[PDB]
Amino acid sequence: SLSKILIAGCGDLGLELARRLTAQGHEVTGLRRSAQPMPAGVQTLIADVTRPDTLASIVHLRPEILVYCVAASEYSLSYVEGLRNTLSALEGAPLQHVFFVSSTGVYGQEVEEWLDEDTPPIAKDFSGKRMLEAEALLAAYSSTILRFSGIYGPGRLRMIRQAQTPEQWPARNAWTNRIHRDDGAAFIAYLIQQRSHAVPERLYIVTDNQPLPVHDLLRWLADRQGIAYPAGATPPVQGNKKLSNARLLASGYQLIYPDYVSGYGALLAAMRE
């Protein structure tokens, strides 16, 4: 039978993942907070991953797959706690794999280089350190850590809005890395479809094909929205890093939005009604 899936964390990524997995025939349940309204038709329960006493029901779901999105939502208190509590509460479930949504922010090194999963991350802030601490736990589990770059998509249109106001553009012209919400969800669904037969890797960077300096993205977005700014050189390109998605491409997954031109092209078209 198709694997039963528990998605812990029902933000936009978890909801889009649930939609795809349900369409493919899986039994999917989410774990959300009470202040998080759900769209009609999604199956969830309310619990608090930081409070073990609210997690006593989840083992009855008997998931074969856990997708844990909470630490990623938290990234955007300790993160490892919530994951530890959730795994402990699943003692007794027929759990075969854990997919953990992490962040490329764990790569705190700033380099004018391409980094990949072989590059050791040097965390430079509390969020990165907490994320690597949450990751570390999974060493004993059959698992895949997914370090997502910056998610964009419906309801994550900050770059589109910022592009409308060139006086508010950042002084530093750093590299930016992104993944569209629907590719992040579809890649996890793809790995779930593959898990039984093409065993997933323990770690992927989940990012699209084209990092770019933030000013190039802002100008491209400004150009397509009729936003005026002065012609001329952008600030020197410096800061952050470039992230390679070579391993994601080698899995056979096909990006829906290979680069910002495709993804932001679609979002501009949709927001216009």
Side-chain angles (χ1 to χ4, degrees), residues 29 31 42 66 125 130 154 169 238 249:
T29 305
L31 194 165
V42 70
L66 172 64
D125 65 355
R130 282 178 283 174
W169 295 355
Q238 191 268 314
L249 292 179

Side-chain angles (χ1 to χ4, degrees), residues 37-76 78-112:
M38 296 288 109
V42 70
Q43 179 96 351
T44 68
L45 65 109
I46 295 160
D48 182 342
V49 299
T50 66
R51 286 174 57 217
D53 284 1
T54 66
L55 302 172
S57 78
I58 69 175
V59 78
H60 284 153
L61 297 168
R62 296 193 59 70
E64 277 100 26
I65 304 288
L66 172 64
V67 182
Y68 193 88
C69 307
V70 176
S73 296
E74 284 163 347
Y75 199 99
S76 81
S78 153
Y79 306 162
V80 67
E81 223 84 335
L83 175 62
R84 194 193 300 284
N85 291 347
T86 297
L87 297 166
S88 175
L90 286 169
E91 190 157 14
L95 189 63
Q96 293 171 325
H97 212 72
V98 178
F99 293 92
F100 175 80
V101 181
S102 183
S103 173
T104 55
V106 300
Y107 296 104
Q109 55 262 67
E110 301 203 65
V111 287
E112 292 297 308

